[PDB]
Amino acid sequence: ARVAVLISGTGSNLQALIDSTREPNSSAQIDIVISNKAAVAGLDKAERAGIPTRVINHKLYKNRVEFDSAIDLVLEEFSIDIVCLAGFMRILSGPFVQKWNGKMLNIHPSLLPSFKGSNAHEQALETGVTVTGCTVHFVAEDVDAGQIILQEAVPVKRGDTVATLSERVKLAEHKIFPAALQLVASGTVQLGENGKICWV
Predict the structure, then answer these.
(1) DSSP secondary structure, 45-96, as one string
(2) N or C, which end of the chain has less CB nearby within 10 Å?
(3) Residue-range domains of the chain with CATH
(4) Around Cβ 85, how many Cβ atoms within 10 Å?
């Protein structure tokens, strides 16, 4: 399966995905890395791996449905089968999420039914849970509510801050994101017709 990773920052998860797809048994290949910003060091890691990089910029023109179309064009140019959101800070339009239904993966820093949103760690700490984690799921129109592929629980330690807890959860992210991409790319897991995850 041909893969495109959309980033917006450092992209630590991108590196994990790059290392994973380079293994001989990987059923996925990363062909294009699309960045939201044009500075972020995610593009550099892509370059070091010899992966085509390419930017966009909202400031360049139009509404939302357009910006996504500018991306979708690059996706068509490279014949992409699967999309991985690796720290892509920019909501997608309803049509784009429609076009790539069951073909776009996202990693969220919480045991998902809980703490949906962009500040999951702050919520977890404020709520006082002793166990949190991360989730890889198919992207649906309903934010952070697509079908769950994999999850990994991570303990919260007393005195934890966003800096220390995110660091611990990040180690779990580097494990399940690549594993989930392999499950989807190999055809082992797919968005089920009954709406639920299907393990063939």
Answers:
(1) HHHHTT--EE---GGGSS-HHHHHHHHHHHHHHTT-SEEEESS--SPPPHHH
(2) C
(3) 1-200 (3.40.50.170)
(4) 20
Tokens standing for residue 114: 């809980």
- Which residues face 151 on adjacent strands? 135
Asked if residue 172 belongs to a known ligand binding site, the reply is yes
CA atoms lying within 13 Å on the CB side of residue 58: 10
> To what resolution in angstroms was this structure determined?
2.2
Furthest C-alpha separation in the chain:
49
Is position 140 annotated in a ligand binding site? yes
Query: Under a CB-based contact definition with an 8 Å cutoff, are residues 141 and 119 in contact?
Result: no
Residue 165, annotated ligand binder?
no
Which positions are catalytic? 108
Q: Which of 143, 164, 166, 131 is nearest to 12 (CA)?
A: 166
* b/e 96-107 (16+ beta carbons within 10 angstroms → b): bbebbebbbbbb
What DSSP state is assigned to residue 156? P
CA angle 160, 84, 81 (to 5 degrees): 165
Q: For 94-161, where are the alpha helices, taking DSSP H only?
A: 94-99, 120-127
Rounded-to-integer distance, Cα 13 and Cα 177, Å: 8
Was 11 annotated as part of a binding site? yes
